[PDB]
């Protein structure tokens, strides 16, 4: 077929609902699936012979890239995405845990200075660390977690407040552009 097919695998409802609208504007067939991390990689693996590229975000994109042979594009979590989440989380209190995959996105000290909060930063490198890391947060007497959706879901399960770092339209448009370019190069 000459039709291009791109899958977005995300837990972000706003992205999932936007993606088919962008597919009309860019003339590709959209596939959307709601998943993260290892489960997302299984769905990506199952789709890979049926689509031209996969788009995902953050840690999920790492799980997907290591398990598929087709183009895997990562939506980057941005510094402003992080600030928006910290700003929103302040409604719960001023002391927060910011949980990031592998590396900081924004300098913790900078966001403390700019938003008048106290932040303890925690890093994780695998899905299997998440439940333990959330327990660690509780032991630090912190009640508010700012992170990606799988992490904030675990926060809420362990009785904490969770504020998810989101992505926006411009980030998704950029990822689509990158995917379309990669598909063209591969072909």
Automatic annotation (TrEMBL):
It comes from Clostridium acetobutylicum (strain ATCC 824 / DSM 792 / JCM 1419 / IAM 19013 / LMG 5710 / NBRC 13948 / NRRL B-527 / VKM B-1787 / 2291 / W). Keywords: ATP-binding, Nucleotide-binding, Transcription, Transcription regulation. This is NtrC family transcriptional regulator (PAS and AAA domains). One of its GO terms (biological process) is regulation of DNA-templated transcription. The keyword Transcription applies. GO terms for molecular function: ATP binding; phosphorelay response regulator activity; sequence-specific DNA binding. The chain holds residues 2 to 186 of 627 of the full protein.
